[PDB]
């Protein structure tokens, strides 16, 4: 429970649905996190085609 669920490598899934000025998009993310080292390794793919905003703007929303 709580902190005990993060002592090792945990798989991560990120699912986002977006709408920016009418431009609708979806992103799927996969990876893992190791809290003991505060490490996050993730790969995000835009499933609706090309992302209408630059990738760096979404990092904080992702994570």
């Amino acid at each position: 429970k709580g902190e005990e669920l993060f002592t090792g490598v945990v798989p991560i899934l990120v699912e986002l649905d977006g709408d920016v000025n009418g431009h609708k998009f979806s992103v799927s993310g996969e990876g893992e996190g190791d809290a003991t080292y505060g490490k996050l390794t993730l790969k995000f793919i835009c499933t609706t085609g090309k992302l209408p905003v630059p990738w760096p703007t979404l990092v904080t929303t992702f994570x």
């Binding site: 920016v20 000025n21 996190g33 505060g38 905003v53 990738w55 904080t60 929303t61 992702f62």
Partner: protein, 163 residues
């Protein structure tokens, strides 16, 4: 997914993120891009089995057609920053404030002001922290074998500010 932040042992009683698990928390943000539009996000971060899931809904309004965002004028990189956290005992959660400086291709910077609010989904007790920050360091790259629009992220987060 700030639940993967490294909280030093002497600061473990200040880890809201992990204490809300497995039930999780709701993370809401208002990202304001200087002289441009804003992103309003609502996310649910929780465990689905042994997997940590982050489900997000993003809404962006008032953006300029040929601004730095919609005109794709930002460099593909990310600067180091600090996420300043404070407790919200009235809502049994936390609040967070920080500034992100995106590099524009001409050499200038696009400021993105972040306001964050987190509240637990479950009824169980959570840890309400004293003022501290999260030192973040990120690196962006591309998978050479990928043809779909993508982003590979390597990130390191460590909590600090309390001795």
């Amino acid at each position: 997914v700030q639940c993967f932040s490294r909280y030093p042992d002497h600061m473990k009683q200040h880890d809201f993120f992990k204490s809300a698990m497995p039930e999780g928390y709701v993370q809401e943000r208002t990202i304001s891009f200087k002289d441009d539009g804003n992103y309003k996000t609502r996310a649910e971060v929780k465990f689905e089995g042994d997997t940590l899931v982050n489900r997000i809904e993003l809404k962006g309004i008032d953006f300029k057609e040929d601004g730095n965002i919609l005109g794709h004028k930002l460099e593909y990189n990310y600067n180091s920053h600090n996420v300043y956290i404070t407790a919200d005992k009235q809502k049994n959660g936390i609040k967070a404030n920080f500034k992100i400086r995106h590099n524009i291709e001409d050499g200038s910077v696009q400021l993105a002001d972040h306001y964050q609010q987190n509240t637990p989904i479950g009824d169980g007790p959570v840890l309400l922290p004293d003022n501290h920050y999260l030192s973040t360091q990120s690196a962006l790259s591309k998978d050479p074998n990928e043809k779909r629009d993508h982003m590979v992220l390597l990130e390191f987060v460590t909590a600090a500010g309390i001795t």
